[PDB]
């Protein structure tokens, strides 16, 4: 199918997310992210990883 399936606008495939705030214990660390999904985008969380 031509239209109504894949966009013709400037849209990325993979995004890179810098940690917003990282904190460390002696046995663990914590990484807070902003998982920003823009307009008209769906994100299956199976495609997300660290």
């Amino acid at each position: 199918p031509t239209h109504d399936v894949t966009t013709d606008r400037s849209q990325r495939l993979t995004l890179r997310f810098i940690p917003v705030d990282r904190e460390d214990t002696a046995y663990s660390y914590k990484a807070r992210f902003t998982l920003a999904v823009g307009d008209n985008r769906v994100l299956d969380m199976a495609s997300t990883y660290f």
């Binding site: 199918p1 239209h3 109504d4 399936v5």
Partner: peptide, 28 residues
Amino acid sequence: FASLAPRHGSRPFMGNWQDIGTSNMSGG
């Protein structure tokens, strides 16, 4: 929603109706 489906010939290649949800568990 035949404009989203690929065209095998001139018919839309649709899935089945009842194949929408999952039902698998640890033995059930």
